[model samples]
Target: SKASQVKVNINNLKGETLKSFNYNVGTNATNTNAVDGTVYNSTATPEHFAQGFADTVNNALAGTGYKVDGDNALNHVANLKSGSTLTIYATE
Candidate 1:
C-alpha cells in the first residue's frame, strides 16, 4: 500500500571536521489503484510532512553556529503521508 523508502543526506562543508548529515524519508500508505483507494482518502502524503520537517530544521539552524549555504539541507519529495517515519542524522 506504500512506495519504497527514500533517503536524503546533507553535508556541512564549512568546517575541516568533515561533518555530514543523513535522513531516511518514508511515505505513508499509497493507493496505486483506483479501486484500492483514492488520493488523500485512506492515507496521507509523506512529502507534506517532510516540508514541515524541513522548516523545523531550518528554523532551528537560524542564528545557530551552522549554516545552510549550498543546496537545501532537505530533499524534495512531491508527496508525503501520515504514519511515516523519517530519520535525520548529522555526523562528522
Candidate 2:
C-alpha cells in the first residue's frame, strides 16, 4: 500500500511559522513528537488521528498561553487526504 505523507505545519497566532514536521501514515503509525510511544491505528479517522499530534504540542506549550488552534484545523482534518498538508496554529 502507498504511504500517506502528512506535513504538519505549526504556526504562531500571528501566522508565523514556528516549526514543521513530516509524518507518514503506514501500517502502524508512530510519532516521536506525539506523546512518548504513542501509536495511531491504521484505521483511525483523519480528524482523531491528527488531534493526537496537536495535543502533544499543546502539552509542550503548557503555560505559554499558546496552543494548537483546534477549531482552525478541525475542518482541514475533515478534508484530509494522502500526501496532503495539515496545519496547527498556536493561539492565545
Candidate 3:
C-alpha cells in the first residue's frame, strides 16, 4: 500500500523536548485501505500548508514564548509528494 500519513512533532524551545501537542495530517478517507487514495488537494497554495502548520504549532505553544518565524517555520511540509511527516521545533 502507498504511504499516506503526515505526522507533525512539536519540540520545546528551551529544552528541545517533545511537546504534548502533536498534529497528524492523515489522508481523509473512510477506511484505512482507502486512506492512500485521499489527496491533500486544496484551493490554497503550498504556502497555505506552511502557514497552517505554523499556526497550529503556535497555537500549541501558546504561553510558551515560542513562535515560528523566518526559516525556522517551514513554508511547506517536506517530502510531501503524497503524504508526509513534518517535525517542527519551537525556539525562544
Highest-scoring model, lDDT: 2
lDDT of 1 by residue, 20-62 (tens): 3332333344422211122112223222223434554555455
- Model 2 RMSD to the real structure? 6.7
TM-score of each: 0.26, 0.50, 0.46
When superposed on Cα atoms, how far off is each prediction in RMSD? 9.5, 6.7, 6.5
The alpha-carbon deviation from the true structure for residue 48 of candidate 1, after best TM-score superposition, in angstroms, is 13
Lowest lDDT sum, 10 consecutive residues, model 2, at 32-41
Backbone clash pairs for candidate 1 read: 1-30, 44-81, 45-80, 45-81, 46-80, 46-81, 47-79, 47-80
Per-residue lDDT of candidate 2, residues 23-89 (tens digit): 5543233231222222222223333334565565666667766666544434234434445555666
1-92 per-residue lDDT for model 3 (tens digits): 12444545566545465554433345353222212212222312232344455566667778877655525325334335323444556667
Whole-model lDDT per candidate = 0.34, 0.49, 0.45
Best-to-worst lDDT order: 2, 3, 1
How far is 44's C-alpha from truth in model 2 (Å)?
10
Better of 2 and 3 by lDDT: 2
Worst 10 residues of 3 by lDDT: 34-43
Candidate ranking (TM-score, best to worst): 2, 3, 1
* Number of backbone-clashing residue pairs for each candidate, in the order shown: 8, 0, 0
